[PDB]
Design a protein around this ligand. Structure first.
Ligand SMILES: Nc1ncnc2c1ncn2[C@@H]1O[C@H](COP(=O)(O)OP(=O)(O)OP(=O)(O)O)[C@@H](O)[C@H]1O
Ligand SMILES: Nc1ncnc2c1ncn2[C@@H]1O[C@H](COP(=O)(O)OP(=O)(O)OP(=O)(O)O)[C@@H](O)[C@H]1O
Ligand SMILES: Nc1ncnc2c1ncn2[C@@H]1O[C@H](COP(=O)(O)OP(=O)(O)O)[C@@H](O)[C@H]1O
Ligand SMILES: Nc1ncnc2c1ncn2[C@@H]1O[C@H](COP(=O)(O)OP(=O)(O)O)[C@@H](O)[C@H]1O
Ligand SMILES: [Mg+2]
Lengths: 257, 543, 890, 139, 72
């Protein structure tokens, strides 16, 4: 009886902690503690079902079990719906060139993020666990968002694989490195850091005043090779084509030298 | 292949057919899963599963226990090996291009057989057990094919002197066969074989594949042009194959037998109430092993002597190992009588000792592979006796008497350090540099002959395969010809080319040619040739 | 051409032109060796294998395709130059072993097999593969297997190698874990089977693209790719697909000769024939140490340093042809300058004896460095330390300081190693002050204890959900230096990592110590090391440090013989004569020091007593500095007692003779209670007997009661402790109470020692068998004092610094009003004594250190600690430590 | 506090429980499993100290060598047996509950609660008077 | 004799068999009572053991080297 009273008090006085995220919303902090409490209560209720005095409290325990399961059935999804979103956030706002490369998935992510922000605003107005669970169709929208995030993540991975296939040297750099490369294609300053991972000795690119034509390459030790025919990024804006042109012109310049 | 084999075994156990899985040693985990799956009842009784594989420790023990093992080994002999090589090579490859190709293949086959049959006599004949498997033979055949195609554009018979002999020799010495050869002295043997076989003289009727076989018989080169003649000559080889077919001394077979016999005893010893006999053995070892030797070293004066420091290190290491062994054997004695508790470490040593395997905690120096414990403790006792003589000589006179000591290299833990210390001392005297000193070896008859300046005395050196008379080497049938007293003299290098009547013999540490200490330049008799010394595995041994 | 190049390398050249010059010299030397012998031995045919074996280059500019312009042929193998830009790479001397490696590898590649150059580590197998790849102009990737391994990256790496057509070499395949080895072997087997099918005799004209199954997808395999598996056997999958090669013995003599010839030395052959056997001797004759490195890489670095030294000498002579230089002297000078700083005190005479054996009659003159020597002397004089040149007292320590300065110039990421008690911290502190006064650049040192805090607090943490990065100690310090809002640049910043080193907290530092100088934070930001920042590792044993960290750091070894006992005595006497314990106090201190000076001599009472006490048996490992610090604290308390007696008698204060008697007897009393003061009664009696034998000072005349039972009264006479023990009558209900303590001889003696060692805020530990009455006596004495607030902390087997932080938060407060944050007890005028009983209980981690013990050591030696909340240095005020524990043998 | 050394099954636990039942003391048994951890042992120690110090109930602490898994349990119990109380067990809200129940026990017995330090001293005295531990182990 | 000991026991048996003959025998003897297989390494073992004490179901626990003190 007092065990059920403890469960009732704990789950009627439990509040979901919220921490600000880049002044955009408040994400749930403390997943580990909440999941530990949920697992402990579920296991304790399962053993309470096994207790001999249980038939007196049976029905009540059953109800709580259902509630507990529902809580579980929510939050295991929720953290996922958070994590991927945060990941996607770090891809879809730190860069400005992702929109042009991935427009359909950009629109889908904007639509997903609108609903996600609305759900977070609704949660912040009532951070109680019972109040959060009782909002209309939280699990339905949460699972829809989870499936959408999975699909868009698969699409982003497929686009990354396509970018690697177009320029095979991208296979050396990491997935996060490739995301930074494609997202920050316009500003070449972020590309020069990874340029020592693809080529054997090339460590930087000597560009023009406006960073529009790749005048040549530069090694780590300061040695510079000037292209016989400079390649232009304005004429070939996509990363793969102008990088392939850079590599081919490097080979040609080395041959002429 | 995993899914294919699973489907095949399913349909074969349903219908009642047979399934073979070849080279299953590459999938140990799959083998375990197959053992688990097969443990269930098999509906059909006519179904048979065969697992052809190589003998590797990666196979699961459960699968070995659950089935019938069949061990297959290739038949020994040069004739069998060459027959296998000729059967493996397709007839189309041999009978193609200039006819000389066929003869070349025969030579290659013969060569392969030689360098494979010498592998059985592992210590004397190949030093180590190299692989020299089928892949090397295929690579050599590909090299021969490519180079013969390059040199002879047309199918017409190319002159024997126009064959790229240098190309084949160098590619099968530096690459392919010599790729796995590490030490220089096996490379010398391989180069000797290649220069003897792969030469333009092989296409003449008087060529001798092997000379002095069984004293006077010689394996004459067959006079054939096609593959059929060579394979018929192979099939006509006599059964009486002595090791002289490989260039090895006839006694090598005897030596091998001896080792095998010892192995049998060890295996019997490894597969044998124990407290009384363990107690008496341990007590006898305590009586045998010297009690204790003390570090009498670390004098501030005369520390500049290299022999001083080297003998300090030797004494310290020997004393440490001596104390460890003595204390552990005393513990074993106590536990045999039940006068002390038994711990995990003591369990390890007692289990190792009852079966005849030396304790890993006891092996602090270089040890011949699979040396039985009694041999180990006898060798250790001899080492401590030598170290005690060293300490007594140091105490009596100082570091000056340390020079005039006939120290045996085998007894020392690190003989290479002794050679280095000798070099440093001979440099310090007369104020020379180490680069300008070269070692000259003089085998003197007197075990205690006079040591003149640079000369240092060494005992226990055993020459295998040859006898040294008046510093001149001569080939002999008897093995392990002991050297009376070796004088190592570090003399200033005169920067001259060694005459063709000298041989650079290695000085290995023990009968297993695994550790090389140094090399000795020995003059040979005028009758012999250095190639015979190289190919018969003549070497000096510290023990 | 070789003569022209050798003339050119002797002058002053730009570093890029110097690298080009030495590459040209190396290749021209190889060409000279090839043509002089390998082609001039009666060779007249262009098709002879004596010429086909050598790597021939054929140039056809008429070819339109760039990849078909240049053809590189060795034996029957023909390759197309990939024209990949390599920059300025290190060139390998073409030794005969390297020639055979090239031949075997090209033969394996032509047959579409792989290469497995097995051999002992350090023979150049990976470097040989890389040099062969760079010779053909192919991108070469080296995958080290020393736990820096990842399938998720190497699957796509293999896909990229198959696609672009680059080379892939594994550093040591056997270093791989069994499952890792098997899976990567499966991938390598698939790739190599595709490569073999690329050369099918019936399908030589490859129409359908030859592809492999990588990442569960079809990947085209470029014909120019190759996989090399460097070993030290091969898995059964790859035995029939890889050709092996024995790279066992590199030709060190030829490498050294060619490199010395490229450096400009005109006697390269003799110098190499001397320097290779010398390095072999140093590897053999010298002792075995973790940080010793006499391999081929160290030899190459020594040779390039010798070339730099010779060029510097040439420039010095020119500004004051020139071929009369003592090349051997330069070579041994470089060898010494590179090896002596990391040599233990035992191996220095051994190294010099080896140098004399190999280089006979050629001696070493160390740099004068007089400009730095003057500032070092001034700083040492103003820091109460001892300075001396060469054979003088302090010569070894100042030479260690100079070596530290040299390694400071040479590279960043220093490591000062040595047994505890050597002059390590003082050395670099004095060097920093001397550099500040000499060069005029202010020196700032950040002393960070790594084991005190967690790795997350040390480097920073990324929020699991918010993905917000908050920087740690080292990250905050480096960021503050880089930003330099106050102007951290233009100042010598030294991040000293005082403490122990383990392979855990140095993982992120490995990318900073090496040439990258690049800290890669988990969030993505990359911090660049400024040229004015040096990362110092002040460690003790260097026992749990990986070879990667040690090899990346220049090292100075501080043996205990560096800091002699005379130096300690001189420092103590100077501080006593200058620093006031509280002018009359300074006068008393000067008189006391004048009185005790004769005993603190080279062979005085204290040195002999220390030597004898080292022979005795102690419950804890006797250290010279613990012993000497206890003795010095006791002498300071003696001076304090003299001052108190003078205060109590304003008229007729302590006279010279009474002070002499009191100090002379108190010296023996403090020696007895500090030397062997942590040993049993028998050892104390033995040390007292030895002191009585060797000393001349009057001693207790009673032959029955040991000297340890006496004490020195303020009048200057030996009085028994039993006279100071009162007879206490305790209430009936207080019999055997948990808190009551009955005064006795041991109680009063330990109380006197406690007060003596707590007057100087020195933490102390009561060791003894269970039930001996350590906790009760310590608590009673601590609570007896009226201005002392005692807090009892029981150290369990899971004690962490978090317990100390919780105690500080509960009892103390942070005040920002002083220069920095100050942690002080809430109660005013109360000294907080943290009685940590069972002090030795906390467990050691996997690398032999206790985090809480290191924490207390940091807060005692330095006087403060870094708060992980804002990475600021808080300074302890009115906080004191006291401990008690059972013997470590329990 | 008593330590009982002897072979298992000799009746140490049974005899100790028999004497505790005769003398009126309650018996507290730590229920250990595979998932037992240091915090659970700390909670058990807190409960037994609360029942022995705040309330005059006398408790016979039944412990066996099996119930001790790591050295932390042993060190906590060494502190409890020697000093009479464990300083670090009560923190925050637990300390406040301790003080409240100590004031309640003082007013039940007829003592003035005074300050926190005097209440803690009274609690320690009650624990050393109203708590006995028997440790059973094999030789 | 071992089967006799298994049939007539006062303290719960501890089966020590290198093979699985005894284990399979004790299953085949107790199928009608629905003998349940568990192990001390299993995380749900306690739960299963709890059920074993409720419906009177025999329970088998393997790997007694890592004995669970909760069974005391
Ligand atoms: N000339 C001197 N140079 C250095 N230390 C000196 C000198 N003269 C006296 N000393 C004393 O020697 C000691 C040197 O301690 P130092 O701080 O150098 O050691 P550390 O290696 O940093 O310490 P730890 O043992 O904790 O690793 C100090 O007590 C110092 O006062
Ligand atoms: N001088 C003394 N005055 C009063 N009691 C003493 C004295 N010496 C020993 N005792 C008694 O001996 C016991 C020692 O108690 P205490 O817990 O302080 O021992 P300890 O040696 O510090 O313990 P441990 O090594 O377990 O930490 C107590 O019962 C104490 O009353
Ligand atoms: N032929 C050579 N000429 C010049 N330097 C060499 C040669 N072989 C090896 N080295 C040097 O040896 C060092 C270590 O070789 P490395 O390839 O790391 O050995 P491993 O094969 O064990 O990895 C390298 O820094 C390299 O410069
Ligand atoms: N004096 C006794 N007479 C009869 N049976 C006893 C006696 N002491 C113990 N036992 C029996 O021993 C069994 C277990 O004893 P237990 O108290 O668990 O021993 P231990 O203290 O070694 O754990 C009990 O079932 C009890 O019946
Ligand atoms: Mg205590």
């Amino acid at each position: 009886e007092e065990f059920l009273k403890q469960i009732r008090e704990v789950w009627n006085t439990y509040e979901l902690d919220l921490v600000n995220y880049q002044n955009k919303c408040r994400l749930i902090r403390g997943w580990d503690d909440l999941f530990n409490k949920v697992k402990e209560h579920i296991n304790s209720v399962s053993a309470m079902k096994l207790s001999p005095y249980y038939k007196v409290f049976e029905e009540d325990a059953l109800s709580w079990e259902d509630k507990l399961n529902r809580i579980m059935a929510l939050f295991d999804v929720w953290i996922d719906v958070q994590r991927r979103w945060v990941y996607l956030e770090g891809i879809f706002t730190g860069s400005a060139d992702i929109k042009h490369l991935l427009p359909v998935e950009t629109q889908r992510f904007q639509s997903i993020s609108t609903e996600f922000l609305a759900l977070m605003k609704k949660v912040s107005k009532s951070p109680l666990v019972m109040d959060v669970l009782n909002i209309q169709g939280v699990q339905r929208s949460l699972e829809r968002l989870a499936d959408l995030l999975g699909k868009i993540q698969k699409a982003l991975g497929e686009y990354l694989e396509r970018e690697r296939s177009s320029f095979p040297r991208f296979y050396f750099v990491g997935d996060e490195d490739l995301l930074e490369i494609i997202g920050n294609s316009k500003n070449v300053a972020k590309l020069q850091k990874h340029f020592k991972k693809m080529f054997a000795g090339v460590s930087s690119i000597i560009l023009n005043e406006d960073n529009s034509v790749v005048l040549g390459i530069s090694s780590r030790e300061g040695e510079e090779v000037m292209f016989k025919t400079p390649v232009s990024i304005t004429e070939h804006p996509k990363i793969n084509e102008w990088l392939t042109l850079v590599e081919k012109e490097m080979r040609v310049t080395l041959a002429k030298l | 292949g995993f899914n294919q084999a699973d489907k095949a075994i399913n349909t074969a156990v349903k219908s009642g057919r047979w399934v073979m899985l070849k080279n299953v040693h590459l999938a140990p985990g799959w083998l375990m899963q197959l053992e688990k799956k097969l443990h269930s009842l098999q509906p059909h009784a006519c179904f048979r599963l065969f697992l052809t594989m190589e003998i590797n420790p990666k196979v699961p023990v459960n699968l070995l226990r659950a089935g019938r093992i069949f061990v297959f080994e290739p038949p020994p002999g040069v004739k069998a090996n060459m027959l296998r090589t000729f059967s493996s090579i397709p007839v189309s490859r041999i009978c193609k291009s200039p006819n000389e190709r066929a003869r070349l293949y025969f030579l290659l086959a013969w060569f392969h057989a030689i360098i494979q049959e010498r592998l059985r006599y592992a210590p004397l004949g190949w030093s180590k057990k190299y692989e020299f498997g089928e892949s090397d033979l295929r690579s050599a055949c590909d090299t021969v094919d490519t180079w013969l195609d390059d040199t002879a554009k047309g199918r017409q018979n190319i002159s024997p002197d126009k064959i790229p002999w240098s190309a084949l020799k160098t590619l099968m010495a530096q690459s392919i066969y010599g790729g796995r050869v590490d030490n220089e002295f096996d490379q010398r043997l391989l180069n000797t074989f290649l220069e003897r076989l792969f030469t333009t003289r092989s296409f003449d009727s008087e060529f001798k594949l092997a000379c002095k076989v069984d004293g006077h018989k010689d394996i004459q080169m067959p006079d054939g042009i096609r593959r059929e003649e060579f394979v018929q000559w192979v099939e006509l080889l006599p059964d009486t194959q002595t090791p002289s077919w490989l260039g090895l001394p006839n006694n090598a077979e005897r030596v091998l037998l001896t080792t095998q016999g010892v192995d049998m005893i060890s295996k019997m010893l490894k597969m044998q109430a124990w407290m009384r006999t363990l107690h008496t053995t341990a007590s006898n070892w305590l009586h045998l092993i010297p009690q204790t030797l003390s570090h009498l070293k670390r004098t501030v004066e005369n520390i500049k002597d290299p022999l001083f420091r080297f003998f300090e290190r030797e004494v310290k290491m020997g004393a440490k190992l001596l104390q460890d062994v003595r204390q552990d054997l005393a513990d074993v004695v106590q536990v045999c009588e039940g006068k002390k508790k038994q711990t995990n470490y003591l369990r390890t040593l007692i289990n190792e000792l009852v079966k005849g395997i030396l304790p890993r905690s006891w092996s602090h120096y270089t040890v011949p592979a699979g040396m039985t414990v009694i041999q180990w403790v006898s060798d250790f006792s001899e080492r401590i006796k030598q170290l005690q003589n060293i300490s007594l000589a140091a105490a009596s006179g100082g570091a000056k008497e340390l020079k005039n000591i006939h120290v045996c290299l085998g007894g020392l833990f690190v003989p290479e350090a002794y050679i280095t210390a000798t070099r440093q001392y001979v440099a310090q005297a007369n104020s020379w540099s180490l680069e300008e000193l070269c070692l000259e070896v003089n085998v003197t008859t007197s075990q205690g002959a006079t040591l003149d300046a640079c000369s240092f005395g060494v005992t226990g050196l055993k020459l295998q395969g040859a006898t040294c008379n008046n510093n001149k080497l001569s080939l002999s049938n008897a093995i392990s010809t002991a050297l009376p007293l070796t004088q190592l003299r570090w003399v200033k290098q005169t920067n001259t080319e060694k005459k063709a009547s000298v041989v650079t013999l290695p000085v290995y540490l023990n009968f297993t040619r695994a550790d090389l200490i140094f090399t000795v330049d020995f003059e040979i008799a005028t009758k012999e040739d250095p190639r015979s010394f190289y190919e018969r595995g003549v070497a000096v041994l510290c023990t | 051409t070789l003569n022209v190049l050798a003339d050119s390398v002797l002058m002053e050249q730009p570093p890029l032109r110097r690298r080009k010059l030495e590459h040209l010299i190396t290749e021209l030397v190889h060409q000279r060796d090839v043509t002089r012998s390998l082609i001039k031995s009666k060779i007249d045919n262009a098709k002879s294998f004596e010429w086909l074996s050598q790597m021939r280059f054929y140039f056809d500019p008429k070819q339109t395709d760039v990849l078909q312009q240049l053809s590189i042929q060795m034996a029957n193998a023909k390759f197309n130059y990939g024209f990949e830009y390599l920059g300025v790479q290190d060139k390998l001397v073409q030794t005969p072993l390297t020639d055979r490696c090239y031949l075997t590898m090209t033969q394996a590649l032509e047959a579409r097999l792989g290469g497995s150059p097995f051999g002992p580590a350090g023979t150049g197998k990976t470097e040989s593969v890389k040099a062969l790849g760079h010779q053909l102009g192919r991108f070469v990737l080296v995958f080290n297997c020393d736990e820096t391994f990842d399938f998720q990256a190497m699957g796509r790496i293999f896909v990229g190698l198959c696609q672009v057509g680059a080379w892939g070499c594994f550093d040591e395949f056997n270093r791989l874990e069994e499952r890792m080895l098997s899976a990567v072997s499966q991938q390598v087997q698939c790739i190599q089977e595709a490569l073999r099918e690329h050369s099918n005799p019936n399908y030589d004209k490859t129409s359908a693209p030859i592809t492999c199954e990588l990442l569960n997808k079809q990947v085209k395999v470029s014909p120019d790719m190759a996989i090399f598996i460097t070993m030290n056997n091969l898995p059964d999958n790859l035995k029939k697909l890889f050709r092996s090669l024995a790279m066992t013995k590199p030709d060190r003599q030829l490498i050294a000769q060619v490199m010395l010839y490229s450096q400009g030395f005109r006697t390269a052959e003799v110098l190499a024939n001397k320097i290779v056997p010398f390095f072999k001797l140093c590897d053999e004759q010298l002792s075995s140490q973790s940080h010793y490195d006499f391999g081929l890489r160290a030899l190459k670095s020594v040779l390039v340093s010798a070339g730099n030294v010779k060029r510097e000498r040439i420039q010095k002579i020119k500004r004051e042809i020139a071929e009369n230089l003592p090349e051997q002297e330069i070579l041994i000078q470089s060898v010494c300058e590179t090896m002596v700083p990391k040599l233990v005190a035992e191996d220095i005479p051994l190294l010099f004896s080896l140098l004399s054996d190999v280089f006979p009659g050629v001696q070493y003159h160390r740099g004068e460095m007089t400009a730095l020597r003057e500032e070092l002397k001034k700083v040492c004089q103003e820091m109460y330390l001892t300075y001396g040149d060469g054979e003088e007292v302090g010569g070894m320590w100042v030479e260690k300081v100079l070596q530290l300065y040299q390694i400071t110039q040479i590279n960043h990421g220093l490591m000062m190693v040595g047994p505890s008690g050597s002059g390590k911290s003082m050395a670099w502190r004095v060097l920093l002050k001397a550099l500040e006064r000499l060069e005029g650049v202010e020196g700032v040192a950040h002393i960070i204890d790594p084991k005190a805090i967690s790795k997350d607090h040390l480097y920073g943490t990324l929020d699991p959900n918010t993905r917000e990065w908050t920087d740690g100690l080292f990250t905050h310090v480096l960021r503050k230096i880089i930003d330099s809002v106050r102007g951290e640049l233009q100042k010598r910043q030294w991040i000293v990592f005082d403490g122990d080193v383990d392979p855990e907290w140095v993982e992120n530092l490995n990318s900073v110590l090496d040439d990258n100088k690049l800290l890669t934070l988990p969030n993505g930001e990359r911090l660049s090391l400024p040229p004015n920042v040096r990362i110092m590792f002040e460690v003790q044993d260097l026992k749990y440090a990986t070879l990667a960290t040690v090899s990346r750091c220049g090292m100075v070894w501080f043996s205990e013989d560096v800091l002699s006992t005379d130096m300690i005595f001189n420092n103590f006497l100077a501080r006593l004569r200058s620093i006031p314990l509280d002018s009359p106090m300074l006068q008393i201190q000067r008189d006391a020091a004048t009185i005790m000076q004769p005993y603190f001599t080279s062979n005085g009472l204290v040195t002999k007593a220390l030597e004898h006490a080292f022979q005795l048996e102690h419950i804890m490992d006797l250290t010279r500095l613990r012993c000497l610090g206890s003795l010095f604290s006791m002498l300071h308390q003696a001076c304090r007692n003299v001052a108190q007696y003078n205060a109590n008698h304003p008229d007729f204060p302590m006279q010279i003779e009474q002070l002499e008697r009191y100090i002379q007897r108190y010296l023996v009393y403090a020696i007895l209670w500090s030397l062997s003061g942590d040993s049993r009664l028998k050892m104390r009696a033995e040390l007292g007997e030895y002191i009585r034998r060797i000393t001349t000072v009057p001693l207790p005349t009673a032959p029955n009661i040991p000297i340890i039972d006496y004490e020195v009264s303020i009048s200057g006479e030996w009085s028994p402790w039993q006279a100071k023990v009162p007879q206490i009558e305790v209430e009936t209900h207080k019999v055997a109470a948990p808190d009551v303590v009955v005064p006795t001889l041991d109680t009063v003696r330990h109380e006197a020692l406690l007060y003596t060692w707590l007057a100087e805020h020195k933490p102390l530990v009561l060791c003894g068998p269970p039930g001996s009455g350590k906790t009760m006596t310590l608590f009673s004495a601590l609570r007896a004092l009226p201005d002392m607030e005692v807090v009892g902390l029981n150290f369990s087997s899971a004690t962490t610094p978090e317990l100390l932080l919780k105690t500080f938060d509960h009892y103390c407060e942070y005040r920002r009003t002083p220069n920095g944050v100050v942690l002080a007890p809430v109660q005013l005028g109360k000294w907080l004594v943290l009685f940590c009983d069972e002090i030795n209980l906390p467990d050691m981690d996997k690398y032999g250190t206790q985090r809480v013990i290191s924490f207390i050591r940091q807060m005692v030696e330095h006087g403060g600690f870094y708060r992980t909340s804002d990475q600021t240095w808080v300074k302890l005020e009115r906080i004191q430590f006291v401990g008690a524990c059972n013997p470590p043998t329990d | 506090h008593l330590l009982l050394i002897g072979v298992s099954g000799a009746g140490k636990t049974t005899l100790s429980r028999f004497v505790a039942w005769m003398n009126g003391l309650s018996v507290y048994q730590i229920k250990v499993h595979r998932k037992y951890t240091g915090e659970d042992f700390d909670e058990d120690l807190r409960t037994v100290l609360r029942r022995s110090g705040c309330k005059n109930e006398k408790i016979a602490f039944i412990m066996d060598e099996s119930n001790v898994l790591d050295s932390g349990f042993l060190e906590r119990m060494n502190t409890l047996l020697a000093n009479g109380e464990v300083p670090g067990l009560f923190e925050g809200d637990e300390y406040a509950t301790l003080m409240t129940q100590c004031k309640e026990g003082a007013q039940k017995e007829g003592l003035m609660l005074d300050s926190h330090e005097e209440l803690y001293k009274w609690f320690t005295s009650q624990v050393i008077r109203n708590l006995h531990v028997v440790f059973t182990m094999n030789p | 004799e071992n089967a006799i000991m298994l049939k007539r026991f006062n303290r719960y048996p501890l089966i020590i068999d290198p093979s699985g003959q005894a284990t399979e025998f004790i299953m085949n003897e107790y199928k009608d009572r629905k003998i349940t297989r568990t192990s001390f390494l299993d995380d749900a073992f306690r739960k299963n053991l709890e059920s074993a004490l409720r419906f009177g179901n025999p329970l088998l626990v393997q790997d007694v080297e890592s004995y669970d003190p909760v069974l005391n």
